[PDB]
């Protein structure tokens, strides 16, 4: 799986047990898993089990989730985006 | 993420923030990301973030979106296809 | 395709002919196939056809199925997890 600080899940609207895509900016690897909650305020991003083959400690990644809805709603849909730098410090927008 | 001229998105019926598949004809790489709108008339195809590992300036790509619908609607469904040549010059037919 | 002891399918709530993801902990390979029922009590995990390129006898794998549901149901959803050790001996807890 991937364990993620609950504060980060809250900001991005990602649920525990939700399908997520992980896109590794460092090594270019792309894979799909599901989200686990890590302790609130821990700033943890932990790649667990088979996913440990696709990312190393220090790798920069983008974690995304996708939802379906009818075309009429999709035209005005607004994704939940959280921005980070340094040691998983979330930039002021939350 | 992939930034695409809004005119191109219009022609293919692709929405901003919609899931897209990119199939790289040049290097054979296949990846899934989402669409970002670029300025109308810019003719931009920009591969951003981790996706920059999968495509280079000059690479020829197919960008596809998929929708779900009941079987009866699927059996008479006509996809929105835009064909390109030269300086990302768009045409209705091949 | 992947043939799985019907007892294991029951415990994980996976249906015959359901889409499954297989994550290979041993070699890091990740692939999508569908579930076939093997004889109840056989403890079989058989990787058939092209999937035999992605897993070998003795490899440790995670087999996952994903379902879609509205957000409210998703927020209290509890996945069906079966844990294994030794001779594909199943337990309810880790």
């Amino acid at each position: 799986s991937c364990a993620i600080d609950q504060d980060f899940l809250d900001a991005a609207g990602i649920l525990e047990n939700e399908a997520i895509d992980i896109w590794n900016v460092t090594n270019g690897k792309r894979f799909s898993t599901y989200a686990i909650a890590a302790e609130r305020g821990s700033r943890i991003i932990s790649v667990n089990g088979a996913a440990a083959h696709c990312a190393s400690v220090g790798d920069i990644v983008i974690i995304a989730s996708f939802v379906t809805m009818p075309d009429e709603e999709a035209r005005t849909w607004r994704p939940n985006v959280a921005y980070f730098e340094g040691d998983n410090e979330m930039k002021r927008t939350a | 993420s992939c930034a695409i001229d809004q005119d191109f998105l219009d022609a293919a019926g692709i929405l901003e923030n919609e899931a897209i598949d990119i199939w790289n004809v040049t290097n054979g790489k296949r990846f899934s990301t989402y669409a970002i709108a670029a300025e109308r008339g810019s003719r931009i195809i920009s591969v951003n973030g981790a996706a920059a590992h999968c495509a280079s300036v000059g690479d020829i790509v197919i960008i596809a979106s998929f929708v779900t619908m009941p079987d009866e609607e699927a059996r008479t469904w006509r996809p929105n296809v835009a064909y390109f040549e030269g300086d990302n010059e768009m045409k209705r037919t091949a | 395709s992947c043939a799985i002891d019907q007892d294991f399918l029951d415990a994980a709530g996976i249906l015959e002919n359901e889409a499954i993801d297989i994550w290979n902990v041993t070699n890091g390979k990740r692939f999508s196939t569908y579930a076939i029922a093997a004889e109840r009590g056989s403890r079989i995990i058989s990787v058939n056809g092209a999937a035999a390129h992605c897993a070998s006898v003795g490899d440790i794998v995670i087999i996952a199925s994903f379902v879609t549901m509205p957000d409210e149901e998703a927020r209290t959803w509890r996945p069906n997890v079966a844990y294994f050790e030794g001779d594909n001996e199943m337990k309810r807890t880790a």
Partner: peptide, 25 residues
């Protein structure tokens, strides 16, 4: 009846803090 797949949300440029191959959960 046309259903779209849309970006729900993303964490942009988080760093992996831990890698656990032998995770049991």
């Amino acid at each position: 009846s046309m259903i779209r797949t849309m970006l729900q949300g993303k964490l942009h440029r988080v760093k992996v803090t831990h890698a656990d191959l032998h995770y049991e959960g």
